[PDB]
Enzyme design. Structure first.
Site, PDB file in Angstrom:
ATOM      1  N   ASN B 241      60.147 -18.503  -6.180  1.00  8.98           N
ATOM      2  CA  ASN B 241      61.322 -17.784  -6.675  1.00  8.98           C
ATOM      3  C   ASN B 241      61.059 -17.154  -8.041  1.00  8.98           C
ATOM      4  O   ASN B 241      61.927 -17.141  -8.917  1.00  8.98           O
ATOM      5  CB  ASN B 241      62.548 -18.697  -6.722  1.00  8.98           C
ATOM      6  CG  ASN B 241      63.051 -19.063  -5.340  1.00  8.98           C
ATOM      7  OD1 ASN B 241      63.105 -18.222  -4.444  1.00  8.98           O
ATOM      8  ND2 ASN B 241      63.422 -20.325  -5.161  1.00  8.98           N
ATOM      9  N   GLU B 281      71.712  -7.198  -9.067  1.00 10.67           N
ATOM     10  CA  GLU B 281      70.720  -7.446  -8.029  1.00 10.67           C
ATOM     11  C   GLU B 281      71.373  -7.419  -6.653  1.00 10.67           C
ATOM     12  O   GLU B 281      72.428  -8.026  -6.449  1.00 10.67           O
ATOM     13  CB  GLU B 281      70.023  -8.785  -8.261  1.00 10.67           C
ATOM     14  CG  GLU B 281      69.259  -8.856  -9.570  1.00 10.67           C
ATOM     15  CD  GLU B 281      68.882 -10.272  -9.950  1.00 10.67           C
ATOM     16  OE1 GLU B 281      69.589 -11.210  -9.529  1.00 10.67           O
ATOM     17  OE2 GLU B 281      67.878 -10.448 -10.670  1.00 10.67           O
ATOM     18  N   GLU B 294      74.399 -11.836  -7.767  1.00 13.22           N
ATOM     19  CA  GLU B 294      74.166 -12.175  -9.170  1.00 13.22           C
ATOM     20  C   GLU B 294      74.083 -10.949 -10.075  1.00 13.22           C
ATOM     21  O   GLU B 294      73.784  -9.842  -9.619  1.00 13.22           O
ATOM     22  CB  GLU B 294      72.892 -13.015  -9.313  1.00 13.22           C
ATOM     23  CG  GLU B 294      72.824 -13.838 -10.592  1.00 13.22           C
ATOM     24  CD  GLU B 294      71.420 -14.313 -10.909  1.00 13.22           C
ATOM     25  OE1 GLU B 294      70.480 -13.917 -10.188  1.00 13.22           O
ATOM     26  OE2 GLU B 294      71.256 -15.079 -11.882  1.00 13.22           O
ATOM     27  N   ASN B 296      72.545 -10.200 -14.132  1.00  9.69           N
ATOM     28  CA  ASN B 296      71.903 -10.732 -15.326  1.00  9.69           C
ATOM     29  C   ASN B 296      72.474 -10.040 -16.558  1.00  9.69           C
ATOM     30  O   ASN B 296      72.350  -8.820 -16.703  1.00  9.69           O
ATOM     31  CB  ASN B 296      70.390 -10.542 -15.258  1.00  9.69           C
ATOM     32  CG  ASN B 296      69.767 -11.261 -14.082  1.00  9.69           C
ATOM     33  OD1 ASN B 296      69.190 -10.637 -13.194  1.00  9.69           O
ATOM     34  ND2 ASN B 296      69.880 -12.583 -14.070  1.00  9.69           N
ATOM     35  N   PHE B 354      49.893 -21.339  -4.914  1.00  2.00           N
ATOM     36  CA  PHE B 354      50.107 -20.000  -5.466  1.00  2.00           C
ATOM     37  C   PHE B 354      50.279 -20.026  -6.982  1.00  2.00           C
ATOM     38  O   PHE B 354      50.961 -19.172  -7.553  1.00  2.00           O
ATOM     39  CB  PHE B 354      51.304 -19.308  -4.807  1.00  2.00           C
ATOM     40  CG  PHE B 354      51.093 -18.984  -3.358  1.00  2.00           C
ATOM     41  CD1 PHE B 354      50.259 -17.946  -2.981  1.00  2.00           C
ATOM     42  CD2 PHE B 354      51.731 -19.716  -2.373  1.00  2.00           C
ATOM     43  CE1 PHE B 354      50.064 -17.645  -1.650  1.00  2.00           C
ATOM     44  CE2 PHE B 354      51.540 -19.421  -1.038  1.00  2.00           C
ATOM     45  CZ  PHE B 354      50.705 -18.384  -0.676  1.00  2.00           C
TER      46      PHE B 354
HETATM   47  N1  LIG Z   1      72.227 -14.952   0.665  1.00  4.19           N
HETATM   48  C1  LIG Z   1      70.852 -15.404   0.561  1.00  4.19           C
HETATM   49  N2  LIG Z   1      70.373 -15.552   1.782  1.00  4.19           N
HETATM   50  C2  LIG Z   1      69.107 -15.965   1.963  1.00  4.19           C
HETATM   51  N3  LIG Z   1      68.325 -16.229   0.895  1.00  4.19           N
HETATM   52  C3  LIG Z   1      68.811 -16.080  -0.354  1.00  4.19           C
HETATM   53  C4  LIG Z   1      70.053 -15.674  -0.531  1.00  4.19           C
HETATM   54  N4  LIG Z   1      70.287 -15.607  -1.863  1.00  4.19           N
HETATM   55  C5  LIG Z   1      69.170 -15.977  -2.494  1.00  4.19           C
HETATM   56  N5  LIG Z   1      68.250 -16.274  -1.578  1.00  4.19           N
HETATM   57  C6  LIG Z   1      67.263 -16.602  -2.393  1.00  4.19           C
HETATM   58  O1  LIG Z   1      67.722 -17.387  -3.603  1.00  4.19           O
HETATM   59  C7  LIG Z   1      66.769 -17.186  -4.473  1.00  4.19           C
HETATM   60  C8  LIG Z   1      67.315 -17.251  -5.864  1.00  4.19           C
HETATM   61  O2  LIG Z   1      68.525 -16.573  -5.920  1.00  4.19           O
HETATM   62  P1  LIG Z   1      69.014 -15.952  -7.371  1.00  4.19           P
HETATM   63  O3  LIG Z   1      70.478 -15.613  -7.289  1.00  4.19           O
HETATM   64  O4  LIG Z   1      68.233 -14.705  -7.680  1.00  4.19           O
HETATM   65  O5  LIG Z   1      68.787 -17.070  -8.551  1.00  4.19           O
HETATM   66  P2  LIG Z   1      67.843 -16.853  -9.877  1.00  4.19           P
HETATM   67  O6  LIG Z   1      68.648 -16.168 -10.958  1.00  4.19           O
HETATM   68  O7  LIG Z   1      67.368 -18.205 -10.380  1.00  4.19           O
HETATM   69  O8  LIG Z   1      66.645 -16.008  -9.532  1.00  4.19           O
HETATM   70  C9  LIG Z   1      66.156 -15.658  -4.156  1.00  4.19           C
HETATM   71  O9  LIG Z   1      64.685 -15.704  -4.149  1.00  4.19           O
HETATM   72  C10 LIG Z   1      66.575 -15.301  -3.039  1.00  4.19           C
HETATM   73  O10 LIG Z   1      65.421 -14.839  -2.172  1.00  4.19           O
HETATM   74 MG   LIG Z   2      68.427 -14.438  -9.772  1.00  2.59          MG
END
Ligand SMILES: Nc1ncnc2c1ncn2[C@@H]1O[C@H](COP(=O)(O)OP(=O)(O)O)[C@@H](O)[C@H]1O
Ligand SMILES: [Mg+2]
Ligand SMILES: CCC(=O)SCCNC(=O)CCNC(=O)[C@H](O)C(C)(C)COP(=O)(O)OP(=O)(O)OC[C@H]1O[C@@H](n2cnc3c(N)ncnc32)[C@H](O)[C@@H]1OP(=O)(O)O
Ligand SMILES: *C(=O)CCCC[C@@H]1SC[C@@H]2NC(=O)N[C@@H]21
Lengths: 261, 673, 247
Positions: B241, B281, B294, B296, B354
Site C-alpha cells: 500500500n 483520490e 479519501e 489528502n 518487495f
Molecule cells: N473500495 C475499495 N475496494 C477495494 N480495495 C480498496 C478499496 N479502497 C482501498 N482499497 C485499498 O485500500 C488501500 C488503502 O486505501 P487508502 O484510502 O488510500 O488509505 P491510505 O491513505 O493509507 O493510503 C488502497 O491501496 C486501495 O488499493
Molecule cells: Mg490513501
C-alpha cells in the site's frame, strides 16, 4: 656598586642545596642519596666538570611563574668526567624538585649533553629517578621525551649507553632506559611501570601495589627488562664502575686490552 | 518569480528529508530567510546546512523531536518566525498543532482546521461527499442485521459486490459476495472475522471493483473561493500500500472523463471551502467509472511529477495563497505540456517481500544531473547515514519528455547512471517495472506487482544476446585490467620485457554454467568470441571511474564494477542488475578441478560477547523485528563502548543476556535464526 | 584516478561524542587510489592495521589505529606487528602514511609481566629509524607517550596534519585536573576551563607541532602533493655497523 657577585653565590648555593633542606632530609630518610654525591661516588675524585648550572624553566602558566616554583638547574645535574682515566658523560635526575619531572630545560640539557657525547665519541651513563612528565608544562614534556628518544636511537650502535634506575620511574620516561644497551636496578627502592596501580585497579579491577607491579624482582626475574639488581646505591655504583671498565669508548675503537699476569 | 510583492520574511520548515530541502530552495528563490529544526542526530543533514538558522528540538526518536509540541513552540518563540510550513507527514494533519500555531500570531501554510476535521474520518468524509453530489463508492449507509440484509443490499445495488467487513476500524478483508449463497456464507464469515477483529459484527456493504486503477486530482484553492484542478496523476503501481512509480498524465483517461473528475473535485473543494493545495483520490474500474476515495489535506509526495507538465511552482502558490493573494491563473491557462514519470529510490532490498528496511552509511553518492531531462530531489549527500527512526527513502527521480516513450527511455538511462555505494537500494525493481511489456502497453492495476511476480522478485531474466554482451564485457574488462597491470616505469638497471601474448583463452562461470571465451586486443578495441559468436567491444577503458560506457556491436551500454578480486570473482552491475561472474584462464580452470570443496558445519547462530563486560541497556525482545544488520545491543567497556549489531537476519526467539549482567566472552547473548 | 579527487564522505565519519568508535579501514579505503588496500595480518592484533596501497601510482605502506578494537590502545602484539612492517618498508624505500587515534597503552598486570616496555620501545625505534618520507594524520586522539611513539614531528617526521576534531594532550582532562588542582578541591569550573582551553589542537598548533589543520575532505589532495615533494629525500647519519634493536 653591582649586586651581580652575590647573585652568583646565591644561585650556586641554591643549586647545591637543591629544593630545600627538608626535602634532602626526606631523601636521606628513605636510604637514598642525592644526585650530586651519586655523581661524586661514580666519577673519579676532582674530575667532574658540571655544565649548564644556570638554567631554569621558562613556563609561566598555572602559577609556575612564582619565585617559589623557580629553581636553577631544573632538577638535573649533567656534565663530563673521567672513570679510571677514560672520558665519560653523565646525567643524573633530582627527585627533590617536582619529583624529577621533566620539562623543557631538563630535556634541553639532556639533549645537549648527549649531542656533545656523540660528537666527541664518549659513552653515556644515565642515573634515572623521575616521577614522569610535568603536566603543567603540557606538550613541552612530550616534545622533550621525543627529542631524547630520537637522540637515543641516533646514537644506538655508535657509543655505549648505560642506564641505572635509582628511584621510581613512571610514564614515558620508562622508554628511555629501554632504548639503551644495558639497564640496572637497585633492590627495594626502584620501580618501572607505564601506569600506576590506581589506574590498573580502576580499569581491570585488580588489586596490586608497586612492589610486585614494577619492582626490581619482577623485572630481573620474570620480565626481562633489567639486567642486574643491586642491594644499595654504593654497591651499585662500584659495580657500575667495574662494568664500565670492560667496554670500549666507541665503535671506532677496538676491544680494550689490559695488562695480564 | 517577482520579488517586488511583499511576503513573509521568516519561514520555519518543521520537517526533514528532501521536502525540507525543496521548501528551503523555493524560499531562497523567493529571497526569504529560512529556519530549520533538527534532532540531535540530524545535526549535519543537507537541509540544516542549506538553511540560515538551526534550532535543535530533542533526542533521536521522532516522538520527541519532530512530534514535540513544546520544542516547536519555543523554537517559534525564540526565532519569531512569521510563517510555519509543515510539508507533509509528521504534524501536517494535526488539528491540535494547527490551532496551537494559529492562536497567538503565527500563520500556518495549509488548510484550516475545519477542513481537516471534516476530512479526518472516513464516515464523515463519505457522507459529506454524498451531500456534495459526487460519485461516491457504490454502497449503502447503515448496519447489517442478518443474511437477509446482506442479500437485499446485493440485490439493491450491483451484483459484483464484496461482503468485506467495513466500518469499525480500518475496514479490510478479502471477501466477495457475488452470488446469493456467496453473499450468505461470506456474510457469516465476515461477521465472524469482525467479531474476532473488532466485534462490530456490522457492515457497510460496498460494490466490487475489478483490477481498480488509482487516479488522483490535484486541487488548489484560496480564501476567495477560487478552485483549480491541475490535471491528474496515476499511482497504480504499489506494494505494501505504498506508491513506488508515479505517472502524471493518465494514459487510461480521455478529455471528457478528466473534465468530469476535475469538476467533481472542484465542487467538493468548494463545498469544504479548501484554501490550499490538496489531492482527491478516485478508483476507476474497467468501465471508466470513477468513485471517490479519501482526500489528502496536505502537499502530496508526488507533486513534482504534475509540476513538470504544468510549470507551476506548487510551494510558491501555497505561500502566495497563505499570504492572502488570489490566484493569478484561470482554468483555461492550464495546459498539459509534455509527459512525466517519477520513481522513488528507497534504501531497501527488493528480494524480500518487495522491500525490507536496511541501514548503513553511504560511501559513494552520485546523481545523473548531466543527463537530459532528469531532475533529482534528495536530502542525501555523500557520507550520510540511513538510520532506523525515519523513512528509509533515499531520493526521487523525475524525467520529463515529449511523450511516454521518450520519458521512459530517459528514466532508464538515468537509472543506469545513478551511483549509490554503501547501502542496498531497489533500482533493479524500478528498471524492471519501467520496461515491462504490460506497463509499456498501458494495462496496469493495483495488483500489478502481485500478479507479475507471484513468487516474488527474482531479478532481470536475460536472453541470449544480453548474456553474450555481458560475457564479452566482463572478459574485455578482465583483459584490460591484466594489460594495465603490466605498465611500470623505466628502471634503467633491469629493463622490462613486456610479454607479447596474442589471444587470451578464458573460462567464465556464470550462474551455474561455464563458457569458453577467446579475447584479442588491437589497441582500444577488443574482439571477443563466445561459443562461436563474435563481438566487438570499444571504450576508453578508464578503470578508475565508477561508471564505464562501452559499445558492443554499436549498441551503447553502461556498466559498473562493484567488486574485483585476484581470485577471479567479479560483481558487475549491468542493465540495473548485479551479476556475479568468475573469470579464469584455461590452465587455471583445468587445474582447479582437483581442488576439494570445503564442507561447512555448525549453525549460523554465532553471536556472543566479544569480550567480558557489562550491558548498559538492552533494547530487544523475543519476536522484535530485525533490520538488515541493525544494531542489536551495546556492551560498554573502558573508554570506548561497543555496539554489536545483528548482521544475520533472523527473528528474535530468546534473549539469554540481560542488561547489567557481567557476561563473559563466548556467552550466548541473543539467539537469532 | 586523479590525485586531487575530493572525499566528502570523511567530513563526518568521526562521531562528536568521545565515547563512540568508528572504522579506520573506511578512511583508508576512501583516501587511497581505486579504494584498493592489501592488508597484512588482518586477524592478528586487530587494534592496529598495516598494509600496502597505491597513491598516484606509487606504492605506499599504511599503518593506523583501529578504535573499534580495545579503544585503539597499544599492546604487546600490535607493537611488534607494526614495528616489523615499518622496518621492512624502510629497508626498500617505500613511503609511510600513518593515521593516529590512540588514548595510550593498555593497562593491566599481564601487560607488565609480559614486558610491554620492550615492545613499545621496538615500535618507537622502528619509527625513529625510518628514513623514507612519512606523512601522519591525527584524526581524534593522541595521549601521553603514545603520541611520540606514533611518529610525532620530533622524530624527524616530515608533514603532520590534524583534523578539526583531533586533540593532543598529556593525559585526560580529569586526571590532569586531579593531579594539578588538588588543594583547590573545586572541579566544578576548573574542569570547564581545562576542557575549553587545552582540549583542542591549538596548544600543539601554536607551538608548531602540527604543520596545519586541514579539512577532512581535502585529506587525500594534500598527501599526494607531499609525496611528490619528498620523493628526493636524503639524510646523513653517523657511521655504524648496525644499531641495537631492543629485541
Ligand atoms: N473500495 C475499495 N475496494 C477495494 N480495495 C480498496 C478499496 N479502497 C482501498 N482499497 C485499498 O485500500 C488501500 C488503502 O486505501 P487508502 O484510502 O488510500 O488509505 P491510505 O491513505 O493509507 O493510503 C488502497 O491501496 C486501495 O488499493
Ligand atoms: Mg490513501
Ligand atoms: C608522558 C607520560 C606522563 O606524563 S607520566 C607522569 C606521571 N603520571 C602520574 O600520574 C603521577 C604518578 N606519580 C606518582 O604518583 C609519584 O611520583 C610516584 C611515582 C608514586 C613516586 O612515589 P612518592 O615517593 O610517594 O612521590 P612523592 O610523595 O614524594 O611526591 C613528590 C612530588 O613529586 C611530584 N610529581 C611527581 N611526578 C610529577 C609529575 N609528572 N608532574 C608534576 N609533579 C610530579 C608530585 O607532585 C609530588 O608532589 P608532593 O611533594 O607530594 O606535593
Ligand atoms: C578517562 O576519562 C581517562 C581515565 C582512564 C584512562 C584510560 S585507561 C588507561 C589508558 N591509558 C590512558 O592514558 N587512557 C586510558
Amino acid at each position: 656598586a653591582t649586586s651581580v657577585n652575590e647573585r652568583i653565590e646565591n644561585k650556586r648555593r641554591t643549586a647545591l642545596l637543591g629544593g630545600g633542606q627538608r626535602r634532602i632530609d626526606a631523601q636521606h630518610k628513605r636510604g637514598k642519596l642525592t644526585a650530586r654525591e651519586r655523581i661524586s661516588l661514580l666519577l673519579d675524585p676532582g674530575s667532574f666538570v658540571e655544565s649548564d648550572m644556570f638554567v631554569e624553566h621558562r613556563c609561566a602558566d598555572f602559577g609556575m611563574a612564582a619565585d617559589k616554583n623557580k629553581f636553577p638547574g631544573d632538577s638535573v645535574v649533567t656534565g663530563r668526567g673521567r672513570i679510571n682515566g677514560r672520558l665519560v658523560y653523565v646525567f643524573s635526575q633530582d627527585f627533590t624538585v617536582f619529583g624529577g619531572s621533566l620539562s623543557g630545560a631538563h630535556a634541553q640539557k639532556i639533549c645537549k649533553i648527549m649531542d656533545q657525547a656523540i660528537t666527541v665519541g664518549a659513552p653515556v651513563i644515565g642515573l634515572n629517578d623521575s616521577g614522569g612528565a610535568r603536566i603543567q608544562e603540557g606538550v613541552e614534556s612530550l616534545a622533550g621525551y621525543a627529542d631524547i628518544f630520537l637522540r637515543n636511537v641516533t646514537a644506538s650502535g655508535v657509543i655505549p649507553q648505560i642506564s641505572l634506575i635509582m628511584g621510581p620511574c613512571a610514564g614515558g620516561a620508562v622508554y628511555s632506559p629501554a632504548l639503551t644497551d644495558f639497564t640496572f636496578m637497585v633492590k627495594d627502592t626502584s620501580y618501572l611501570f607505564i601506569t600506576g596501580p590506581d589506574v590498573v585497579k580502576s580499569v581491570t579491577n585488580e588489586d596490586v601495589t608497586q612492589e610486585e607491579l614494577g619492582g626490581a624482582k619482577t623485572h630481573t626475574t620474570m620480565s626481562g627488562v633489567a639486567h642486574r639488581a643491586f642491594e644499595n646505591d654504593v654497591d651499585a655504583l662500584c659495580n657500575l664502575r667495574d662494568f664500565f671498565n670492560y667496554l670500549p669508548l666507541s665503535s671506532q675503537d677496538p676491544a680494550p686490552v689490559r695488562e695480564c699476569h | 518569480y517577482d520579488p517586488n510583492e511583499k511576503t513573509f520574511d521568516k519561514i520555519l520548515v518543521a520537517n526533514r528529508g528532501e521536502i525540507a530541502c525543496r521548501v528551503i530552495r523555493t524560499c531562497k528563490k523567493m529571497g526569504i530567510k529560512t529556519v530549520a529544526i533538527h534532532s540531535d542526530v540530524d545535526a549535519s543533514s543537507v537541509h540544516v546546512k542549506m538553511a540560515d538558522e538551526a534550532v535543535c528540538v530533542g533526542p533521536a526518536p521522532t516522538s520527541k523531536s519532530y512530534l514535540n509540541m513544546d520544542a516547536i513552540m519555543e523554537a517559534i518563540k525564540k526565532t519569531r518566525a512569521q510563517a510555519v510550513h509543515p510539508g507533509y507527514g509528521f504534524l501536517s494533519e494535526n488539528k491540535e498543532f494547527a490551532r496551537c500555531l494559529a492562536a497567538e500570531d503565527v500563520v500556518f501554510i495549509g488548510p484550516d482546521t475545519h477542513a481537516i476535521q471534516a476530512m479526518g474520518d472516513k464516515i464523515e468524509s463519505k457522507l459529506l461527499a454524498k451531500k456534495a453530489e459526487v460519485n461516491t463508492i457504490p454502497g449503502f449507509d447503515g448496519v447489517v442485521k442478518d443474511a437477509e440484509e446482506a442479500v437485499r443490499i446485493a440485490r439493491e445495488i450491483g451484483y459484483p459486490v464484496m461482503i468485506k467487513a467495513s466500518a469499525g476500524g480500518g475496514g479490510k478483508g478479502m471477501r466477495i459476495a457475488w452470488d446469493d449463497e456467496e453473499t450468505r456464507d461470506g456474510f457469516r464469515l465476515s461477521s465472524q472475522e469482525a467479531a474476532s477483529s473488532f466485534g462490530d459484527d456490522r457492515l457497510l456493504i460496498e460494490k466490487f471493483i475489478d483490477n481498480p486503477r488509482h487516479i488522483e486530482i490535484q486541487v488548489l484553492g484560496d480564501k476567495h473561493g477560487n478552485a483549480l484542478w491541475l490535471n491528474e496523476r496515476e499511482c497504480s503501481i504499489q506494494r505494501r500500500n505504498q506508491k513506488v512509480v508515479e505517472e502524471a498524465p493518465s494514459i487510461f483517461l480521455d478529455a471528457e472523463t478528466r473534465r468530469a473528475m476535475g469538476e467533481q473535485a472542484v465542487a467538493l473543494a468548494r463545498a469544504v471551502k479548501y484554501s490550499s493545495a490538496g489531492t482527491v483520490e478516485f478508483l476507476v474500474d474497467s468501465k471508466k467509472n470513477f468513485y471517490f476515495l479519501e482526500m489528502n489535506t496536505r502537499l502530496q509526495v508526488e507533486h513534482p511529477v504534475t509540476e513538470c507538465i504544468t510549470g507551476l511552482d506548487l510551494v510558491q502558490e501555497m505561500i502566495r495563497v497563505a499570504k492572502g493573494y488570489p490566484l493569478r491563473h484561470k482554468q483555461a491557462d492550464i495546459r498539459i505540456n509534455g509527459w512525466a514519470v517519477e520513481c522513488r529510490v528507497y534504501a531497501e532490498d527488493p528480494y524480500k517481500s518487495f522491500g525490507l528496511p536496511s541501514i548503513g552509511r553511504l560511501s559513494q553518492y552520485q546523481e545523473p544531473l548531466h543527463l537530459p531531462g532528469v531532475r533529482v530531489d534528495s536530502g542525501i549527500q555523500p557520507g550520510s547515514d540511513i538510520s532506523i527512526y525515519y523513512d528509509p527513502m533515499i531520493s526521487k527521480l523525475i524525467t520529463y519528455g515529449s511523450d511516454r516513450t521518450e520519458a521512459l527511455k530517459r528514466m532508464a538511462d538515468a537509472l543506469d547512471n545513478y551511483v549509490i555505494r554503501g547501502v542496498t537500494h531497489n533500482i533493479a525493481l524500478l528498471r524492471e517495472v519501467i520496461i515491462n511489456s504490460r506497463f509499456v502497453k498501458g494495462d496496469i492495476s493495483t495488483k500489478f506487482l502481485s500478479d507479475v511476480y507471484p513468487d516474488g522478485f527474482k531479478g532481470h531474466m536475460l536472453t541470449k544476446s544480453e548474456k553474450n554482451q555481458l560475457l564479452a564485457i566482463a572478459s574485455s574488462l578482465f583483459v584490460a585490467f591484466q594489460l594495465r597491470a603490466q605498465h611500470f616505469q623505466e628502471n634503467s638497471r633491469m629493463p622490462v620485457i613486456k610479454p607479447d601474448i596474442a589471444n587470451w583463452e578464458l573460462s567464465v562461470k556464470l550462474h551455474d554454467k561455464v563458457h569458453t571465451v577467446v579475447a584479442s586486443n588491437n589497441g582500444s578495441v577488443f574482439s571477443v568470441e563466445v561459443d562461436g559468436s563474435k563481438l566487438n567491444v570499444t571504450s576508453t577503458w578508464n578503470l578508475a571511474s565508477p561508471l564505464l560506457s562501452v559499445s558492443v556491436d554499436g549498441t551503447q551500454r553502461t556498466v559498473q564494477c562493484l567488486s574485483r578480486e585476484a581470485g577471479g570473482n567479479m560483481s558487475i552491475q549491468f542493465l540495473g542488475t548485479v551479476y556475479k561472474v568468475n573469470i579464469l584462464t584455461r590452465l587455471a580452470a583445468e587445474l582447479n578441478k582437483f581442488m576439494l570443496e570445503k564442507v561447512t558445519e555448525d549453525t549460523s547462530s554465532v553471536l556472543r560477547s566479544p569480550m567480558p563486560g557489562v550491558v548498559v541497556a538492552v533494547s530487544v525482545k523475543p519476536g522484535d523485528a530485525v533490520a538488515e544488520g541493525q544494531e542489536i545491543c551495546v556492551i560498554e567497556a573502558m573508554k570506548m563502548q561497543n555496539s554489536m549489531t545483528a548482521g544475520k537476519t533472523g527473528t528474535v526467539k530468546s534473549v539469554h543476556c540481560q542488561a547489567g549482567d557481567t557476561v563473559g566472552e563466548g556467552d550466548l547473548l541473543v539467539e537469532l535464526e | 584516478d586523479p590525485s586531487d579527487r575530493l572525499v566528502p564522505e570523511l567530513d563526518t565519519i568521526v562521531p562528536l561524542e568521545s565515547t563512540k568508535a568508528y572504522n579506520m579501514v573506511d578512511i583508508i579505503h576512501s583516501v587511497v587510489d581505486e579504494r584498493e588496500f592489501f592488508e597484512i595480518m588482518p586477524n592478528y592484533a586487530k587494534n592496529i592495521i598495516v598494509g600496502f596501497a597505491r597513491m598516484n601510482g606509487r606504492t605506499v605502506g599504511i599503518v593506523g589505529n583501529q578504535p573499534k578494537v580495545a579503544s585503539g590502545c597499544l599492546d604487546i602484539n600490535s607493537s611488534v606487528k607494526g614495528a616489523r612492517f615499518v622496518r621492512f618498508c624502510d629497508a626498500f624505500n617505500i613511503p609511510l602514511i600513518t593515521f593516529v587515534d590512540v588514548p595510550g597503552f593498555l593497562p593491566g598486570t599481564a601487560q607488565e609481566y609480559g614486558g610491554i616496555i620492550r615492545h613499545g620501545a621496538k615500535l618507537l625505534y622502528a619509527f625513529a629509524e625510518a628514513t623514507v618520507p612519512k606523512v601522519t594524520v591525527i584524526t581524534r586522539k593522541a595521549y601521553g607517550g603514545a603520541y611520540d611513539v606514533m611518529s610525532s614531528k620530533h622524530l624527524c617526521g616530515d608533514t603532520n596534519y590534524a583534523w578539526p576534531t583531533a586533540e593532543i594532550a598529556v593525559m585526560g582532562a580529569k586526571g590532569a585536573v586531579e593531579i594539578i588542582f588538588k588543594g583547590h578541591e573545586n572541579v566544578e569550573a576548573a574542569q570547564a576551563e581545562y576542557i575549553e582551553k587545552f582540549a583542542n589542537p591549538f596548544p600543539a598548533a601554536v607551538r608548531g607541532f602540527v604543520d596545519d589543520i586541514i579539512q577532512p575532505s581535502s585529506t587525500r589532495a594534500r598527501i599526494c602533493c607531499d609525496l611528490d615533494v619528498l620523493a628526493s629525500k636524503k639524510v646523513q647519519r653517523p657511521w655504524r655497523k648496525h644499531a641495537n634493536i631492543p629485541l
